[PDB]
Each structure stands twice: as C-alpha cells, then as structure tokens.
Amino acid sequence: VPSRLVKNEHGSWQLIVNGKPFIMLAGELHNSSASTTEYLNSLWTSLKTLNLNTVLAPIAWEQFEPQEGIFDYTLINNMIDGARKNGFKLSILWFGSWKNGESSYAPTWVKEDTKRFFRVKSVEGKEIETISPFCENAMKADAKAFKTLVEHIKKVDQATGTVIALQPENEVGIFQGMDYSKASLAAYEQEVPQALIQYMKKNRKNLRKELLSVWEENGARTSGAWKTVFGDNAWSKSFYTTWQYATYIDFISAGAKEIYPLPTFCNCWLVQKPDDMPGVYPNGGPVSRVMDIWKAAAPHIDVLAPDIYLSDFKNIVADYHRADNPLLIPGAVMKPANAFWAFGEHSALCYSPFGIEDGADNFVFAQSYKVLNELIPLISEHQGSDRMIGVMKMPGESERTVTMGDYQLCIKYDAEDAYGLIIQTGKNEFVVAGINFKVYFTSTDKKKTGYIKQVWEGGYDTDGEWKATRLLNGDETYHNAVLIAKGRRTFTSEKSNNYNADHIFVYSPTSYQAVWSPGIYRVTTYLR
Amino acid sequence: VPSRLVKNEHGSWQLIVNGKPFIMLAGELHNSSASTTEYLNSLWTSLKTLNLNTVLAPIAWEQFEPQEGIFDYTLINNMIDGARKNGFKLSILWFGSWKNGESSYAPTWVKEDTKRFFRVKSVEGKEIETISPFCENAMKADAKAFKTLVEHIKKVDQATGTVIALQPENEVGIFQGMDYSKASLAAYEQEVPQALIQYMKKNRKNLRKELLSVWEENGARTSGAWKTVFGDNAWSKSFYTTWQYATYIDFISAGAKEIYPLPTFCNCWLVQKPDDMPGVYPNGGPVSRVMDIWKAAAPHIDVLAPDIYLSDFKNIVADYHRADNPLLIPGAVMKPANAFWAFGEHSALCYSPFGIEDGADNFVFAQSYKVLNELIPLISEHQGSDRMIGVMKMPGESERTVTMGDYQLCIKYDAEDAYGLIIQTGKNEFVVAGINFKVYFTSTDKKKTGYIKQVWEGGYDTDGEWKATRLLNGDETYHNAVLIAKGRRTFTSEKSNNYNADHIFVYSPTSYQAVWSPGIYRVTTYLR
C-alpha cells in the first residue's frame, strides 16, 4: 500500500506516503462540489493557489451505486485524474449510510425500501430520514458498496498512491437520546459486549472520565445488561448507540482493509457546549466523550477525527489527541494559526479548512501552507518529541514561557493574530516559524548567561535545502536581544507615504503598504 | 403567416412563431430611439447583452408617410435588417393617430388640416393636440397608412417572420370626461350599438362589474340611447368614448388583417389610483374597466395589453388576464421578479421593460432572461396548466403554500427580492427556477410522509437538453430537508476576506464577493 500509518521513535504516528513522511496540508470541498466532473474540474486552479498538498473530496453512495449492483466510476476516476494532473493527494470521503447524522446520500433504492432498510424512529414513533444503525441490511449494502469503491481505487491507484486515506461516513449519529426502532429497543436490553468490558478493564487508568464515572457509579460491573452496567440514563443510551455505530462502521471498514488497507478515519460533530446531552450533537459519533467505546468497537478505524469550527481550538485539539489517537482535523476554519498549532504542538497528520475552494486568493493562508510545506521534513523529524511546540495567542494572553534544553524561551505576542511553531534542532539551535511574536532566549541555569548568537531568515528550496535570505542583526534583532518573527513581506500596490521618525528607536520609512505571512528563522544560541 | 395565436389543450393562448411556441423576452425602446437608422443601429449590441429575444420598436406615421401618398420605408427596412442581424424578433408599434392620448406623431399634413382632421375639444371649447376619434377622415387616413406598412412587412418578411406582432396606436384616450367636438356630442345621443348589447347579454357572467352594474342600475335595457341604457354620468361618457376608440382602431386593424393577419394588441395607460375617474387616465384606452367594450367593438384586436409601472404588480396582472385575454405586458419596469410572475403564474406571452436600451448593465436582469430562455419549451408546455405557478414575494409576505398533486409545497422567502417559478413535470418531479426562496415538500395525504428524493442544479443547453451542474445535497439542501433556490453565482473581482465561522451551521468561507441570479433546479420527491 502506498500510504500507511507508522509510529516513530517518539511514539508519534506518522503518515508514510510513497516511502516518505507526509503531512496533509489539506482542504475539504463543499459537499456538492464533487457531484459532477465539470464542477470539480472548474476548481483545481483555485485549489493550487492555496498550496494544498491534499484535497478531501466525497464520493456519494447515491451516485456511485445508482441502482443496486450497478456502479458508476465516473466521479472517482475523474477525481483521481484531476488530482494527479494538479499535484494533489486525495482523502476520499464516503458519504454512505450517514452524513451529518442523516441518510440523504443513500441511494434512491435504499431510501425507497423502508421495509428492508428500516429508519430510526423518534420518541413519537415517526420514521426519520436516517437509516437505523441497527439495520444490518443497510450495513451490508453500505459495506459492499464501500469495498467495491476501494477495490477500484486499488486497481487504478495502488502503484501511484494518489489516494492516501479514507473517511467512511461523515459525522454520524442521531439527534435523539436513542433510536426508538424496535431493534434499537431490543438492543438496549442486551448484555454489554465483552469486547467493551475487556477494553474498559485493560485501559481502566486511561478511560475517559465520562465513561469511567458512569461505569463506577453502577459498581464497575464486568457483566450484565447495558442498564445494569451503566444505569438507565442518557449516558447508557449514548453508549449502546455509540457501540452500534462504531460496530456497523467497523464492518464497512474491515471489508476494505482486507483487500487494500489505507489509513482510515471517522469524523465527529463536536459536543458544542459542555452541558450538551447526546442528541443535541449526533449521538453515536466519535466525540471524545465516547472515544473508548469507538476504540473498543472499531479496530479497523485508525483515527477519530474532530471537525472543529469553534473558537476554543487549543483545548479541543488537546481533548482529541491521545497516545492511541493522532490529531487529524478534516473540517475546520480557514485560519493559519490553527494549522501551526495543530502541526507544531500536537504533531497533527492533517489540517483541512472546510469549503476550501471558495477561499482562493486567501493570500496569508496560502503563504502559510507554503511555509508549512517547506517545513514538512523537519516537523516530521520532530513529531512526538519535546523539541517541538506550537505558538498561538488566544484573546487576553500576552506570553508563553517554555524550557527547551539549556534555554528558557519567552514568547511575547505583538498582535492579536500571533502564531507559529518552534523546533529545537540542536543543543544550541532553533528553527522558529510564524508571525507577530518575539522570542527572548535566556539560560535555564542561572550561573550562566544565555544569548542569541546569530539569526538567519530564510526557507527551504525545492530540494529541501535551507537557503538564507538575510542574516538578521542590528535593528532586525534589537542587536540580538531578541528574535522578531516579523514574517515574510509582500508590498502591495497601495501608497503608504510613511517617512516620519516614530519615537527602542528604529527608522523604517515606507513607501508602500505591505502584507505579511509566516517566516522561517534559524537561531543559534550560546551560553557563557 | 409566420406568427399566430393558438389556444393549447389547457385553453391558454400561445404565440406560435415559425411553427414553435414562442414567449417574448422583450424590451421596448425609448420612444425616439428608432427615429433614425444610426441611432437605432447604435443600440443592437446593448440589447444583445440583455438576452432579449424580441424588441418592441415604433414606426411613426409622421415619418412613414411624410407627405400624403408618399411612403418612406427606410426605418422599417433598417429595423428588420438589424433585428435579423442581431437575432431578435420585432413587435412593431404603430405611432399613428394617438400615442399617450395625443396626436404628436400624426404627419405634418394631418396636423395642419384641422378642417379635414378635426380635433378633440375641451369643456372650455379649446381644440387640443389630439385628433378626435369621431373623425372618420383620420380613421381612414391612419388605416390606409397602417395597411401600407403591413403590406410592406408581408412583402419583405412573410417567409422569415422577424415581425411577430403589431400594436396599433399607443395608450389611446382623452384626458377628459368626454370629447366636446360637435361629432362627439352627436354620438352620445345615438342608440347603443346592438353589438354591445348582444355582447353584454351573452357574456354577462364574465362582464366587468364596472359595466354590468351601470347597465343593471339602468334596467339592463336591450335598446335605447347611451344615456338611456347607461344613465347620464361619467361612465356612460366613458363607454361611448371607448366604443368609439375601439371601433376606429378595429377598422385600422381590420385592413391589415385582411392582407396579413399578425397577432395584434392595444396597450393601456392604467387607472393609476382606485378613485380615478375617466380622463385622469386616457379615457378610451383598454383599461380593464372597459375591456368588455373593447372586446365587443374590436374583434380584429387580439389582446388588451397593460403597461405596468406601478408596484401592485400581482393584483394588476390578475385584473388583465382573462379567458379571452392572455397576459401581454409591452411596457414595464426592469425587474426580474415581475417577469417570472407574469410568465409562471399567468402564462404571459410578453414581458417588456420600457427604455430597455438604457439597462444594458443590468447583470441580474440579463441572467434572468438567460434562464427564462432556457425554460421557454417547458413554460410553453405548461401554459394554463395547474402544474405551473409563479413565485414572487411582496412586502410583508412570508410564504406561499400550494398543493401540487400528491405534494404540498411551502415556499419561504429568504430575502426581500425573492422570485421564480415552479413546474410539476411529473407525479414525483418538479422544476424550480429563481432565487432567494426555499421550498419544503410534504405529502398531501396525511398518512404518508413526503420528502425530497434528490436535487440537481443545472440548465438547458443550446439544444434544449437538461445539463446538471451539481447534485445538490448535504449543506446545499440541509440534507434534503429543503430546496434552496440560492441562484447561479458569479464571483466579482471585489475582495470579501470572509473566513470566520458564523454561528443550521454551514461553513462558507469566501475570498471574493459574489452576485447571484436565478437558478434552475430539478427536484425528485417520494412518499414512504
């Protein structure tokens, strides 16, 4: 297989694509944007301006299997062709049984047979436009269609590896406390599967507190029915619902894994607010609260991947990043700070703004992905190590202090939008990337004086070699008192006529207004 | 004849041009814009940008017969040539005896001979700049010139049919209660024509309440003078004045119909305000109040056509559209909503903004005509059908609810400017065109569930074949909860810089601002 997840010397998972470490500098198309060849083909040049290396794009079951047994390879073939022609990798999103909780992408022949493919029932007894996760017919039909898709991908792509990942379903779950279908009601009464109990015993110390607390409130029993082991309540209902979803999707993934195993992730719609009960978000999806249930139920799913559109980004990513779960963000906001934080602080595999094709000529985001691309080899070398951190200011923060080997770094922010990453590449050497912050280096050990030795601004060329554009000194480093991560500059056409001395004094007359994006800096340090 | 009016299976009148149904996506030139070949010829490229298929343009009697018996074919010839070169059909307006009530386009040799061609007189006894409709010399002179123009058109156009319709005179009538010329005063004393009496007897159930009530109030008499049959009042005055106008113009039309019968319409200056008496608007014109008088008097006039510049567009068009009177709007505002409403709700033959050459920069209007052109075959097939409706929001309105066979449609407006049309093309299929509304589909039969099955966005190509641009799903249909008629999108060059999440959540980042115009959607539904 040309794409594989492999744990590195630090215990961080890495994506190895065509034999090298690969980080998805990605974006996800709008949902309907891959539904015709012409519409998708109209987007490639937009996407290239953003410097993506990876596009997340859906294949819909309704179009892929328009009548049962009859497959249409038009869209996957054209998608793969266009990605190759435009220098992109693909992560294929499978909009099958469920997309945002519902079954709107199921085939017409699935939708119209509600006897074979039964629906979720509301508390009111009404069938909704969601196939029940308790319907094995649907599970089997979805599995067959997905495995057929993956068979084809292997046939047309095993040698090239344009396709590097798979996402079965999209943000699954019900907007209810439970499914009231007869099969759901019956499942709730059953014995808790031993695979879950055995996972909880084995992983007891590291279980989510949400699962552990319910289990323990009911005696932490190692057998019995759902309502015996977890009580009769919203959580027990969520737990057996989640078990069913993870189980159904695991079955779909396993069929694919058996013939062509690619890195496979499932994505969640987040618990939007801390008090929210299951069903205000999709009940069943791999939110962090039920991470253990998904891991226990679905070993053919590699990663549980948060879709993040909320402002509390740093806390959210820390919540999803675990020893058994690399950070992978398939839908997010088009904000470069978030990318640098995910990649540098949490060694993330993917950052992917949603609706990417509508953001062409977002210049700062584009130049941010250019800089991240230059850094992929170095980021890859330091994933999971304590020698790499992110930088990202949040409202009301003024600094970050960290210790890195012999040095203390005081990161101070110079604007609301301040972000980047820092890698200690050497005992006395750092690479700093980003914008709108400064770094002060001092000695950890107080019997010594630590100082910047030399600062170089630059980038990595198309061969991966460091090329310096300036040795930054004097005004540009306040005489090596500090690293200023001002960023790479781009003058605009607009006149600036800025010639007056501004009263540490630096005279910086300017004729044009300018635009700024992350820079890359190599700092050597010394102790005396 | 290459243009004719023919009633379809639904009893709606259609214009059949060169043997195919034709709807006039039209505009009228400013009055003086066809007065030289150079001035007209400078307009054709402007007109093409608006996606017109038809131009309404005048021929002026003063120019066509500048000396009695001497005809100048320069302007008609150049107009037909230009229309053919630029792919337009023509409706020819004949500005003869009257235009906007007055006689300013009568030839100089008519104007100067008030003995032969006598004028309307005011209540003060002043002769005005309007030829009296009681002057048979002017009727016959106008008729001879009009026939001569129509003979020429047949000679140069009977095979091509660039000219598809004729409008004799323009907004006729007097700004007085009655004409006070000798002949007018004598006519008021005459016996009501039997053709009017018999029309009222036979058509009583469909008569205007304006005419029926005055008849009834005076005993519904079947003989007697105007003042006996209708009383001595402003209405009686309007009725005999209107009879006169309709008779004079019928004679003019009849001479052309004998030699080359083209669809023929006469247009009105509306009753501007409900209390307005005859004479505040042109007394004699075919306003809906006296439409029965026009129908009784003028069998050689096919359509009575309102010029509409007032905002109460829906009430007005419903007032003019009758079983014996298709909707034809030769002068209107340049507003796409009005077009969609006229064509969809009332199966109109023509929509025509006045002063069209001035509106060449109207992107949205141009794109609206592009979509209506794509829909002409489909609109044509459903004219007069209960399967076709229009959509148009008026201030303060929130929704429209309609039944279409098995489905109930709830149309909700998402902006002030919300318009389009809806056609049920199948038991379980709809075409929806337009912008800024949503359509919710449910089942009429209360014990079934109706839902959207699939949604495509697209258009009709230059062969008339449907071409889908997307299968709309997910965010784009709220997971098939609703049809969103967002419209066809055109990015402008203007920067948007719009990357913030906006808290059903959809993440829609945009680099450029956009303009929207009507789209076309194909919606399949189902019942489970």
Residue numbers in the entry:
A (entry chain B), B (entry chain A): 20 to 522, 526 to 550
What did the original publication write about this model?
In this study, we identify a β-galactosidase with novel substrate specificity from Bacteroides xylanisolvens, an intestinal bacterium. The gene encoding the Bxy_22780 protein in the GH35 family is a component of a gene cluster containing SusC-like and SusD-like proteins. In this study, we found that Bxy_22780 specifically hydrolyzes β-1,2-galactooligosaccharides. We propose β-1,2-galactooligosaccharide galactohydrolase as a systematic name and β-1,2-galactosidase as an accepted name for Bxy_22780.
To learn more about the binding modes of the natural substrates determined above, the ligand-free enzyme structure of the E350G mutant and the complex structures of the WT enzyme with galactose and methyl β-galactopyranoside (MeβGal) were determined at resolutions of 1.91, 1.86, and 1.94 Å, respectively. All the structures in this study were tetramers based on PISA server analysis, although the asymmetric units of these structures were found to contain two, one, and four molecules, respectively. The three overall structures were almost the same except that a loop region (insertion 2, residues 506–539) was visible in the ligand-free structure. The reactions using the E350G mutant (a nucleophile mutant) were performed in the presence of various monosaccharides as acceptors and α-d-galactosyl fluoride (α-GalF) as a donor. Reaction products after the reactions for 3 h were detected only when galactose and d-fucose were present as acceptors. The pure β-1,2-galactobiose (β-1,2-Gal2) and β-1,2-galactotriose (β-1,2-Gal3) produced by the E350G mutant were used to investigate the substrate specificity of wild-type (WT) Bxy_22780. Furthermore, the E350G mutant used for a glycosynthase did not show activity when xylose was provided as an acceptor.
